[PDB]
Design a protein around this motif. Structure first.
Motif, PDB file in Angstrom:
ATOM      1  N   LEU A 141       0.968  -1.057  -0.101  1.00 12.17           N
ATOM      2  CA  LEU A 141      -0.266   0.306  -0.208  1.00 12.17           C
ATOM      3  C   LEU A 141       0.425   1.295  -0.355  1.00 12.17           C
ATOM      4  N   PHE A 142       2.287   1.356   0.495  1.00 12.33           N
ATOM      5  CA  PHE A 142       3.268   1.972   0.623  1.00 12.33           C
ATOM      6  C   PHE A 142       2.923   3.020  -0.836  1.00 12.33           C
ATOM      7  N   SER A 143       3.235   1.902  -1.656  1.00 12.60           N
ATOM      8  CA  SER A 143       3.801   1.897  -3.044  1.00 12.60           C
ATOM      9  C   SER A 143       2.876   2.663  -3.583  1.00 12.60           C
ATOM     10  N   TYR A 144       1.591   2.392  -3.729  1.00 10.63           N
ATOM     11  CA  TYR A 144       0.732   3.015  -4.552  1.00 10.63           C
ATOM     12  C   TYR A 144       0.350   4.839  -3.785  1.00 10.63           C
ATOM     13  N   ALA A 145       0.884   5.097  -2.370  1.00 12.49           N
ATOM     14  CA  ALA A 145       0.735   6.440  -1.907  1.00 12.49           C
ATOM     15  C   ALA A 145       1.563   7.250  -2.190  1.00 12.49           C
ATOM     16  N   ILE A 146       3.064   6.745  -2.138  1.00  6.99           N
ATOM     17  CA  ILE A 146       4.073   7.258  -3.179  1.00  6.99           C
ATOM     18  C   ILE A 146       3.755   7.440  -4.676  1.00  6.99           C
ATOM     19  N   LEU A 147       3.059   6.691  -5.326  1.00  8.65           N
ATOM     20  CA  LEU A 147       2.650   7.417  -6.647  1.00  8.65           C
ATOM     21  C   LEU A 147       2.089   8.219  -6.942  1.00  8.65           C
ATOM     22  N   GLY A 148       0.717   8.159  -5.835  1.00 11.19           N
ATOM     23  CA  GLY A 148      -0.346   9.141  -5.130  1.00 11.19           C
ATOM     24  C   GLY A 148       0.763  10.353  -5.000  1.00 11.19           C
ATOM     25  N   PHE A 149       2.277  10.264  -4.133  1.00 14.19           N
ATOM     26  CA  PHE A 149       2.503  11.629  -3.776  1.00 14.19           C
ATOM     27  C   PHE A 149       2.808  12.016  -4.691  1.00 14.19           C
ATOM     28  N   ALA A 150       3.674  10.962  -6.320  1.00 16.19           N
ATOM     29  CA  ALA A 150       4.844  11.994  -7.288  1.00 16.19           C
ATOM     30  C   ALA A 150       3.622  12.143  -8.286  1.00 16.19           C
ATOM     31  N   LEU A 151       2.635  12.034  -8.532  1.00 17.25           N
ATOM     32  CA  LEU A 151       1.607  12.541  -9.246  1.00 17.25           C
ATOM     33  C   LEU A 151       1.123  13.857  -8.818  1.00 17.25           C
ATOM     34  N   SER A 152       0.641  13.615  -8.104  1.00 18.04           N
ATOM     35  CA  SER A 152       0.053  15.209  -6.969  1.00 18.04           C
ATOM     36  C   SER A 152       1.209  16.621  -7.029  1.00 18.04           C
ATOM     37  N   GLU A 153       2.808  15.484  -6.841  1.00 14.02           N
ATOM     38  CA  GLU A 153       3.445  16.780  -7.083  1.00 14.02           C
ATOM     39  C   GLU A 153       4.305  16.624  -7.539  1.00 14.02           C
ATOM     40  N   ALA A 154       3.823  16.165  -8.858  1.00 14.87           N
ATOM     41  CA  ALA A 154       4.141  16.396 -10.371  1.00 14.87           C
ATOM     42  C   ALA A 154       3.246  17.839 -10.639  1.00 14.87           C
ATOM     43  N   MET A 155       1.614  17.286 -10.513  1.00 12.25           N
ATOM     44  CA  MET A 155       1.306  18.571 -10.649  1.00 12.25           C
ATOM     45  C   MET A 155       1.550  20.470  -9.898  1.00 12.25           C
ATOM     46  N   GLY A 156       2.402  20.180  -8.749  1.00 10.97           N
ATOM     47  CA  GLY A 156       3.030  20.936  -8.040  1.00 10.97           C
ATOM     48  C   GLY A 156       4.252  21.842  -9.246  1.00 10.97           C
ATOM     49  N   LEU A 157       5.105  20.870  -9.571  1.00 14.17           N
ATOM     50  CA  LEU A 157       6.051  21.481  -9.820  1.00 14.17           C
ATOM     51  C   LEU A 157       5.744  21.565 -11.760  1.00 14.17           C
ATOM     52  N   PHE A 158       4.293  21.354 -12.185  1.00 15.99           N
ATOM     53  CA  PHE A 158       3.254  21.565 -13.256  1.00 15.99           C
ATOM     54  C   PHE A 158       3.473  23.440 -13.139  1.00 15.99           C
ATOM     55  N   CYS A 159       2.670  23.635 -12.102  1.00 19.57           N
ATOM     56  CA  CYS A 159       2.311  25.113 -11.470  1.00 19.57           C
ATOM     57  C   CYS A 159       4.017  26.008 -11.230  1.00 19.57           C
ATOM     58  N   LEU A 160       4.895  25.014 -11.059  1.00 21.56           N
ATOM     59  CA  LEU A 160       5.980  26.401 -10.567  1.00 21.56           C
ATOM     60  C   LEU A 160       6.817  26.063 -12.147  1.00 21.56           C
ATOM     61  N   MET A 204       5.465  27.230 -14.931  1.00 17.50           N
ATOM     62  CA  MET A 204       4.689  28.586 -14.946  1.00 17.50           C
ATOM     63  C   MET A 204       5.584  29.463 -14.242  1.00 17.50           C
ATOM     64  N   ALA A 205       5.891  29.246 -12.998  1.00 16.28           N
ATOM     65  CA  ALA A 205       6.132  30.190 -12.259  1.00 16.28           C
ATOM     66  C   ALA A 205       7.765  30.587 -12.950  1.00 16.28           C
ATOM     67  N   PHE A 206       8.448  29.588 -13.667  1.00 13.83           N
ATOM     68  CA  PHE A 206       9.867  29.952 -13.697  1.00 13.83           C
ATOM     69  C   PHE A 206       9.748  30.972 -15.391  1.00 13.83           C
ATOM     70  N   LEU A 207       8.342  30.557 -16.137  1.00 16.46           N
ATOM     71  CA  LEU A 207       8.187  30.772 -17.385  1.00 16.46           C
ATOM     72  C   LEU A 207       7.751  32.583 -17.532  1.00 16.46           C
ATOM     73  N   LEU A 208       7.361  32.758 -15.886  1.00 16.74           N
ATOM     74  CA  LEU A 208       6.459  34.064 -15.535  1.00 16.74           C
ATOM     75  C   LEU A 208       8.091  34.702 -14.642  1.00 16.74           C
ATOM     76  N   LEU A 209       8.913  34.456 -15.287  1.00 17.03           N
ATOM     77  CA  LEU A 209      10.180  34.341 -13.844  1.00 17.03           C
ATOM     78  C   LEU A 209      11.140  34.941 -14.814  1.00 17.03           C
TER      79      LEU A 209
END
Ligand code: CDL
Ligand code: CDL
Lengths: 102, 75, 134, 104, 48, 219, 82, 37, 75, 75, 75, 75, 75, 75, 75
Positions: free
Chosen positions: I46-65, I67-72
């Protein structure tokens, strides 16, 4: 001529290059010939700016590394899985012929 | 002053990412309460995963707070 | 394909009979059962177990307590303390026991055990009132 | 869309899309380059002829790298590099407009 | 065989069964025991 | 942290135009010759027969033999997303005409066939089920707007994934240097993670669009 | 692999002869363009500084006009400096 | 719950639950079902 | 500068989606606690599923980051 | 007064972090209702854990309240 | 200039619409952990439905990201 | 006159923070329903903690609305 | 010049609501994961209601995206 | 003209705060479905508590919309 | 002219707040799926509550449209 199905495909070195290309230079410039021409051609295209080293080159490297890792990790399993299905088809067809004769 | 105004507006718009860490903390600590009502004998490893949940939810909250100072003093 | 083993100390209702749906009032929520259900088990509570067989026939079986177990092989074992069809029950008798239970609650006082028994009979009486009037 | 009319099942046998079913012409490999102009002018340049020549070449390549039983990943890597090489030369105008060296 | 509440929680295949808490397991075990005892009492009386 | 570049979607950069970039999946089609299939033919056949079995639960009578169109739409989407991530190929899905061809003719096919066959049920799909009278008219108008522009967002969705995917890869590539080993290794490893994400989303986006069209051809 | 078979005694001489010719022509052209690069970069830098200084004055004028346009749009008070 | 909170066994709860069920069996089945011991 | 102000305002409003990473991480890691409250011996799978969920959610975090670099530094 | 005007907008855009305190407190104390509906014997252990969750969730709200004052009388 | 300046501001305001996609992703992948915890024998079919959930979750955020890309250097 | 202008925008952006109170209240009274459906014999104790949840969420929301008034009459 | 320019600011802030549509879709499909670990026999009827849940969730994002197109070039 | 303009931007920002009431209402009536799906015999007090959540979530939503008018015509 | 530009930002800002209606609609239809997974014989009552849940969450969404329309052509 009756078309006969070969068992193994054509010989291939460096992953994708045909071996018939590499053996084509053996009688003149030996084994090292095709590699020398390939190394010289790669150097010439990079040096004379014919090969533009832009942002997509790094993506091309990233695909090449991912493709080599993915194929070397799962190639044996997939090829055995496909060969398993071929064997089951071959067994099914030969058993049909034997059952029809019996 | 115009570029100073940009820094203050950019900082005030980049400090809303802590709202998501506020929700993410509430989700993990909320689920900890339910997860501890059922089978309370697993307390130590449950608390460890809760702290693990806090150590990533709050840390990504500081990801925006770092960008808040990156729009405030550094750039 | 859902094997049903609804039995009781008094009567026996089904033995490995294919049922489309059985809804069970349990302590974990008055949920329902379909074939190849969730592997789980739960404790019965005073309520109206219903049976919906392959023909869609609706049958109501009020029980007083028991157990409900669903295994991974789509085998349903519902055992209840006294399962009866609800048609042979009286709503007037249900309120009479309910009023008697309310008297037990009011006269319990410092007797917390008797207070619990009054509460238990209140739950049974309220279950039968909804059972008989529905 | 039909089998070519030059194909005869009685003499050749079953159809094979990698074999040329016309008159047996001498291929360009053994032409001593004194017959090069004659060989090029003899072979017609119809859109039908070149399309049939492409398919007869494509099925030859299928017969060497895919249609054998143990066909590896080598054809599918050759196609990707082959398409990437071909499409880089097409987009050469956009790529060479940027470059890296001002003199080179 | 008759098991206990503590043994039921420690079972290897009991994780496949869901909705398991302390009160559900405790009440189910103490009624499964009173259903096995009733089954033997009917078998023993008929055999006797 | 250096710069960025864009505009990889020019169809006429050379006199051999980029319409050949759409004729590349014809090469990858597994042409079959022998009775006993080869390895890639059996793999492709097993995948397609697997998808046909999974979609068989959602076919229905109105899509009695339209599963070939759905599967062909699936393979076309997959070979226009997978091939769009290889480096020196222009992003075909970025051009809206490919996405126009993807969504508009099939949506008009499904909405007109629904209107001719079940007109009242099509209008009842524009209302939530069991809607009372005071809750009716605003739900109807918004769902009319929803069903009119839903396939347009499907076309936008297919475009936006590969546009955002290729913009991210070009951004990571352009902010790296060949000479610096540290920057190149970081750039390469970042793109490998991003490609694994982009390969995964491309397959899943093709899978969901097959599922959505199978649901909307069933009705 | 295949056993080695020696190259013909004319390919090697042509190969290394062209190798040496490329080296000296490489040295000659690189030195010639190095002088050209040095003299071109010096004059390019001088005209870039003059152009950048003039473009800085034009950018300063355009930004003040843009700041003047903003104050006209917002209707806020116009300071003496801006 | 209330039963466990008052420290009442489920078997004792069962007997109270079945006795109240049996007392609502007025027409014919009260005496036939209750055979005592 | 006016356009420098537009970059900063965009960058501050590009840090909004960091809140989404915090909520997505808090949801996944909280729901892991409930999913681990049952089956304590099922930790690793079950820990593997959570890290997969964490990686995709944090991938959205860097996805928004992104546009942070593009506008910087980019646009 | 433009620099002070930007600080007023910046602080006003910084007080949206209270929304993180609202959802986290609402989710945690809602989950406490579920966690106290069943197993009320540990109603002091669960309550202590939820107040810990409430404190950390409300700390993020005070973080943005501080950031609003940090763009108000600190620069 | 000012037209381009407001194009960058609108691009930043379009980057807001990715946080909720991160929320929906964390909800599906968090519930996937619960979904695998309850009856782990349905691992493959539940994974297919959660991946289907991720397909529509990020795609809604991609609409705003494309709108951000439209106002970055396309409008 | 831009100071009054900045207060109007700031107080408008400050008033977003009552959304987190809105979602939290809808969460706790949502979970109150689940809590009431499971073991309703503790109705008044569960409702008491539900009001404590309401008095800790809406208080933060009206704490943010108080900052909106302060951003119109004190800052 | 500021007319279409601020229209682009409004258009970027109008397409925010697709984020919550993404959060809504993940909420429906995540709950389908938990709702399929129990009761696989109702796969079709649960999915059809989940699709109706997904359709009404994506209709809200398109409702905001149409409002973004309303302010983009529809006047 | 500046005052009417900034009140228009501020009232637009104040209208975001009704989103959380939109999520809260969708939360409380979500868990009412779960709370009625288990032990439906308590529909009277469940709907009484569910309307209590709706009458508090939407009240905070109208609190934001009341403040939107105060920055549109009052101040 | 400035009032035209300020109306556009506010109208875009007013449509930020429809994400909460987007998330809540997915919440109420998500919890329909779980609530109809168990207890399938209450389909009529459960789905009627999902309609009521959608009718109130989108009502908050239309309240955003009302203020977006109010800040686009009315005021
Ligand atoms: C939710 C539902 C989900 C449903 C799921 C359903 C289930 C899944 C179903 C899957 C179905 C798949 C579809 C059908 C596929 C059919 C495949 C098939 O039949 O193949 C059989 C195949 C059997 O192959 P085999 O040869 O018998 O055995 C393989 C060996 O075991 C391998 O061992 P080996 O050592 O013999 O192999 C070596 C080989 C393995 O390497 C590879 O295979 C990878 C090759 C590279 C990948 C592609 C990159 C190409 C370039 C792209 C960028 C272009 C820019 C230019 C280049 C830049 C970079 C240098 O190559 C090398 O590593 C050595 C040479 C390196 C070549 C790479 C390039 C270097 C260039 C150097 C300069 C030369 C000139 C360049 C000119 C241009 C510059 O098995 C497979 O299926 C393998 C593929 C599996 C997929 C891999 C990815 C996923 C994991
Ligand atoms: C390879 C393609 C199939 C080859 C099969 C073959 O040669 O026999 C069949 C047949 C000739 O049979 P045959 O005349 O009865 O027997 C002659 C023997 O095979 C013996 O053939 P041969 O004596 O004529 O000599 C082989 C000949 C084969 O003839 C050809 O040149 C090919 C003729 C077809 C033209 C189009 C070729 C495909 C497109 C080329 C561009 C993409 C290549 C991607 C992979 C390479 C990347 C470096 O190749 C050459 O002339 C040597 C060229 C060497 C140039 C490069 C030097 C080595 C560089 C190493 C770099 C290492 C770096 C590290 O050839 C064809 O007609 C092939 C038609 C292919 C149609 C296109 C299908 C698509 C291809 C992929 C895209």
């Amino acid at each position: 001529p009756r078309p006969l199905r070969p068992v193994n495909p054509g010989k291939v070195r460096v992953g994708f290059v045909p071996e018939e290309w590499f053996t084509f230079f053996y009688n003149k410039t030996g084994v090292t010939g095709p590699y020398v021409l390939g190394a010289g051609a790669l150097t010439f295209l990079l040096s004379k700016e014919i090969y533009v080293v832009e942002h997509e080159f790094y993506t091309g490297v990233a695909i090449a590394i991912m493709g080599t890792y993915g194929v070397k990790k799962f190639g044996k399993q997939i090829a055995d899985y496909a060969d398993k299905g071929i064997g089951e088809i071959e067994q099914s067809f030969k058993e049909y012929q034997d059952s029809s004769k019996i | 002053d115009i570029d100073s105004a940009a820094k203050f507006i950019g900082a005030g718009a980049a400090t809303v990412g802590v709202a998501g860490s506020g929700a993410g903390i509430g989700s993990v600590f909320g689920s900890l309460i339910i997860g501890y009502a059922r089978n309370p004998s697993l307390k130590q490893q449950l608390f460890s995963y809760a702290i693990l949940g806090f150590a990533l939810s709050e840390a990504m909250g500081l990801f925006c707070l770092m960008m808040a100072f990156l729009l405030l003093f550094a750039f | 394909q859902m094997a049903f083993t609804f039995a009781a100390p008094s009567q026996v209702f089904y033995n490995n009979a294919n049922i489309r749906q059985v809804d069970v009032p349990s302590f974990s929520g008055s949920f329902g059962i379909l074939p190849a259900h969730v592997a789980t088990l739960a404790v019965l509570k005073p309520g109206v177990v219903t049976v919906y067989q392959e023909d869609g026939s609706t049958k109501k079986y009020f029980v007083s307590s028991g157990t409900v177990t669903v295994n991974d092989d789509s085998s349903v074992q519902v055992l209840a303390e006294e399962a009866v069809p609800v048609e042979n029950l009286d709503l007037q008798a249900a309120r009479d026991i309910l009023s008697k239970a309310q008297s037990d609650v009011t006269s319990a006082g410092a007797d917390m055990l008797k207070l619990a028994e009054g509460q238990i009979a209140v739950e049974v009486g309220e279950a039968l009132v909804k059972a008989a009037e529905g | 869309g039909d089998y070519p009319a030059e194909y005869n099942p009685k003499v050749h046998g079953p159809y094979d899309p990698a074999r040329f079913y016309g008159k047996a012409d001498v291929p360009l490999g053994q032409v001593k380059l004194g017959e090069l102009s004659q060989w090029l002018g003899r072979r017609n340049k119809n859109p039908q002829a070149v399309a049939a020549a492409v398919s007869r070449g494509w099925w030859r390549w299928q017969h060497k790298y895919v249609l054998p039983r143990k066909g590896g990943i080598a054809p599918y890597i050759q196609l990707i590099v082959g398409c990437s090489i071909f499409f880089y030369a097409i987009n050469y105008g956009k790529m060479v407009a940027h470059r890296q060296r001002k003199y080179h | 065989p008759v098991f206990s509440k503590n043994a039921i929680e420690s079972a290897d295949s009991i994780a496949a069964y869901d909705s398991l808490d302390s009160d559900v397991i405790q009440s189910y075990v103490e009624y499964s025991l009173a259903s096995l005892i009733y089954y033997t009492m009917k078998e023993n009386a008929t055999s006797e | 942290m250096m710069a960025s570049l864009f505009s990889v979607f020019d169809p006429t950069s050379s006199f051999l135009s980029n319409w050949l970039s759409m004729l590349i999946p014809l090469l990858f089609m597994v042409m079959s010759f022998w009775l006993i299939p080869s390895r890639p033919q059996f793999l492709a056949k097993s995948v397609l027969m697997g998808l046909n079995r999974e979609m068989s639960l959602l076919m229905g009578p109105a899509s009695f033999g339209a599963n070939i169109l759905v599967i062909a739409l699936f393979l076309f989407i997959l070979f226009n997303n997978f091939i769009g991530l290889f480096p020196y190929i222009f992003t075909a899905t970025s051009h809206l005409a490919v996405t126009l061809s993807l969504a508009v003719p099939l949506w008009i096919s499904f909405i007109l066939y629904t209107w001719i066959k079940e007109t009242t049920n099509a209008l009842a799909h524009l209302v939530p089920l069991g809607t009372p009278a005071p809750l009716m008219p605003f739900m109807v108008l918004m769902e009319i707007i929803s069903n009119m522009i839903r396939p347009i967002t499907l076309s936008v969705r297919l475009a936006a994934n590969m546009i955002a995917g290729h913009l991210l890869l070009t951004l990571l590539g352009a902010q790296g240097t060949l000479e610096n080993l540290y920057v190149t290794s970081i750039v390469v490893f970042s793109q490998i993670i991003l490609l694994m994400l982009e390969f995964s989303v491309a397959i899943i986006q093709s899978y969901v669009f097959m599922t959505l069209m199978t649901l909307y051809a069933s009705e | 692999f295949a056993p080695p078979v020696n190259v013909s005694p004319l390919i090697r001489a042509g190969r290394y002869g062209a190798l040496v010719v490329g080296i000296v022509y490489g040295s000659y052209r690189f030195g010639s363009l190095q002088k050209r690069e040095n003299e071109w970069r010096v004059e390019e830098a001088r005209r870039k500084v003059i152009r950048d200084a003039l473009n800085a004055e034009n950018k300063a004028k355009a930004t003040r006009e843009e700041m003047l346009y903003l104050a006209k749009e917002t209707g806020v008070k116009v300071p003496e400096n801006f | 719950s209330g039963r466990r909170g008052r420290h009442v066994d489920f078997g004792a709860s069962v007997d109270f639950e079945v006795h109240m069920m049996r007392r609502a069996l007025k027409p014919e089945l009260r005496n036939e079902a209750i055979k005592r011991e």
